[PDB]
Amino acid sequence: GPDLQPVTYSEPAFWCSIAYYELNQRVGETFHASQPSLTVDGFTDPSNSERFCLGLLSNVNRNATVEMTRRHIGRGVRLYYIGGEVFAECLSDSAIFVQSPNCNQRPATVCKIPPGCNLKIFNNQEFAALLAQSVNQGFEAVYQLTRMCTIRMSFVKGWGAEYRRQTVTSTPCWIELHLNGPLQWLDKVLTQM
Amino acid sequence: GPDLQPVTYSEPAFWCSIAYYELNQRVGETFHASQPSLTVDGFTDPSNSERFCLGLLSNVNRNATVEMTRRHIGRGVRLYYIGGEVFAECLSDSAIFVQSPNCNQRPATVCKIPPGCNLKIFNNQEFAALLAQSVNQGFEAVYQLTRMCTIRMSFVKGWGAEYRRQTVTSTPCWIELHLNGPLQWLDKVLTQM
Amino acid sequence: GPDLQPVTYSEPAFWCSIAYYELNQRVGETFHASQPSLTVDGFTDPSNSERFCLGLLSNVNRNATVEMTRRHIGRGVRLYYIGGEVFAECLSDSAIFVQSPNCNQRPATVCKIPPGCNLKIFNNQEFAALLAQSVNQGFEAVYQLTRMCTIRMSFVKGWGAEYRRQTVTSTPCWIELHLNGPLQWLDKVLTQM
Amino acid sequence: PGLQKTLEQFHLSSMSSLGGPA
Amino acid sequence: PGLQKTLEQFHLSSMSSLGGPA
Amino acid sequence: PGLQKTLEQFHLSSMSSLGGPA
Numbered sequence: 001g002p003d004l005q006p007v008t009y010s011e012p013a014f015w016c017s018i019a020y021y022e023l024n025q026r027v028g029e030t031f032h033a034s035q036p037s038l039t040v041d042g043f044t045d046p047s048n049s050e051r052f053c054l055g056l057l058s059n060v061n062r063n064a065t066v067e068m069t070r071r072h073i074g075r076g077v078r079l080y081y082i083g084g085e086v087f088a089e090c091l092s093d094s095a096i097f098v099q100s101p102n103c104n105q106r107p108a109t110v111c112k113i114p115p116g117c118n119l120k121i122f123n124n125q126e127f128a129a130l131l132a133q134s135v136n137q138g139f140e141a142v143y144q145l146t147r148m149c150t151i152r153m154s155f156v157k158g159w160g161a162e163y164r165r166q167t168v169t170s171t172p173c174w175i176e177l178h179l180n181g182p183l184q185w186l187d188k189v190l191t192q193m
Numbered sequence: 194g195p196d197l198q199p200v201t202y203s204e205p206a207f208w209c210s211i212a213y214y215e216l217n218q219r220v221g222e223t224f225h226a227s228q229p230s231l232t233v234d235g236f237t238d239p240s241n242s243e244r245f246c247l248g249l250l251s252n253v254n255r256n257a258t259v260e261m262t263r264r265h266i267g268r269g270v271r272l273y274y275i276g277g278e279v280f281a282e283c284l285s286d287s288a289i290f291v292q293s294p295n296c297n298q299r300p301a302t303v304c305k306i307p308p309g310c311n312l313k314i315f316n317n318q319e320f321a322a323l324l325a326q327s328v329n330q331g332f333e334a335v336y337q338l339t340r341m342c343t344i345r346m347s348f349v350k351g352w353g354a355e356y357r358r359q360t361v362t363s364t365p366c367w368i369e370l371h372l373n374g375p376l377q378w379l380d381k382v383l384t385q386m
Numbered sequence: 387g388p389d390l391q392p393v394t395y396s397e398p399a400f401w402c403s404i405a406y407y408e409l410n411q412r413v414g415e416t417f418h419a420s421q422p423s424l425t426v427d428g429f430t431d432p433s434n435s436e437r438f439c440l441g442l443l444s445n446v447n448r449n450a451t452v453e454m455t456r457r458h459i460g461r462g463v464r465l466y467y468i469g470g471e472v473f474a475e476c477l478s479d480s481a482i483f484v485q486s487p488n489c490n491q492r493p494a495t496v497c498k499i500p501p502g503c504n505l506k507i508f509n510n511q512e513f514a515a516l517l518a519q520s521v522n523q524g525f526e527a528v529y530q531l532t533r534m535c536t537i538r539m540s541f542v543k544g545w546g547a548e549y550r551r552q553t554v555t556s557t558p559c560w561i562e563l564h565l566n567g568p569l570q571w572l573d574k575v576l577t578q579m
Numbered sequence: 580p581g582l583q584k585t586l587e588q589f590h591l592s593s594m595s596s597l598g599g600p601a
Numbered sequence: 602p603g604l605q606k607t608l609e610q611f612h613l614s615s616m617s618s619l620g621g622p623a
Numbered sequence: 624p625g626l627q628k629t630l631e632q633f634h635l636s637s638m639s640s641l642g643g644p645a
Binding site: 204208276324372375377381 | 580582
Binding site: 184 | 431442444502
């Protein structure tokens, strides 16, 4: 057996996974989205396939700054896609902040979404174009394209160049979104490098 | 779209979730209980929907004090509910210790359960009464009612005012129970504050 | 009720679970294997029941040494069993390193698997013989037999006596395999000690 | 309003069940 | 080769879907 | 007793399977 395993692809049961963080620690289980629309909020429903409720997640190493920020998440953010493009809507009373390398390519730019705004955060056509442009740049170049399939968002507090908090590990409440569809296409290119 | 998403409720497939800790680090996956009765013990069955077996969970940052305590969990604790009340039974050879803010309301009191005892740890009617009493106290008051839906328990070693270990993060083996039903009712009130 | 709960056994839906680590921190969700054959690689497919893809897992506390090692996992390791014996095949361009107390019993010996090799890592008959030999050695002796049902493996970098990295917590990329079948048999003996 | 209704539903369901508002 | 094919498939599917290569 | 039985069952099942005691 000098050949490798035949690679097969099955459609993901979830179009994205979301991991919640407080400062630099994972908090709670990873949320998986089986529906085209979902909301990440600060409430306490643990059994809604369309709601990732952060208010019920406990953290015994949590300080008062994180505790106060959690109370301001409120209605949180609505995440849903149309076609090959993903977007985020701020339902909360406080703003939300987004770091999307796929959006920066069009590299740490953090964008505010004021309460009530509807903003786009991903375009799969521009990712495929970049993925096509990256195959010429080597294996390690394409391998680091995972950053384009992941989107980080912070509630209430911002971070980056325009803020005292330099990194996302300094924000009290943030999430990391993984786009499973594009990750599969990236997987097929990586296996062919 | 100035209105929010229509909120719907589906009955939880699990009446509680349990997270295991060693000192202040999460160890292992979160256990979800689909049956009315379950036991958390120190044995090694990974595939029993009625048993959360802690002996198979590994922790590479584990000291000898935690290792020794794990060997004394034994038969552990039996957790099951009747109606709207949850209780815990000590099947182990060593005692177990419980911190229930819902029980303290009737705020860090830790109660021993000697080997062989059967003790109640939650009353949903008293929680609803407090939840009803709390809506008048503001949003932040009700938001912190999640502490009443969570119950922390330590094996073998105790903590609190009567012990050298001041906090639960100092105990070698402890678990955190989340009551999903009451959390949903709290969610509905929070969305209406 | 002075008697304990009647113990029942249901066949595990997964023959093993795999947890990924970077240095001494858990990274990503635990993988569960429902198929007799599986590969742990450094690529980015999140929805293949036969592939544990480590390249999509993110770690915000990750240094450049771990980042560089991740890019060399490549095709990774193929894990599959035949009968009552488990083995590992190195599909990667770099070697892999294995610490198996069940293999050491025949206690930290780390064995290289060069790229393209096929090597066995577990024998359930020798574990049962040891489990039978251990019941005479006391409860605490049998309780520590969980080490024989777990197998740790490192990618690219080795550790142990022959290396500067003394412990597995010093390796940038490693996994921990749990054998659920043998763990159940160990559970039945532990409940009868 | 609808909050007092939810409180009354919960007050009722709390007497014999851990079930949620479904 | 087969890499240019995958790039062309993805270029096509990217226009209207987040679906993978299945 | 019943422990020697379990040891004998496991000794038997270990020869050709990773299956548990079910």
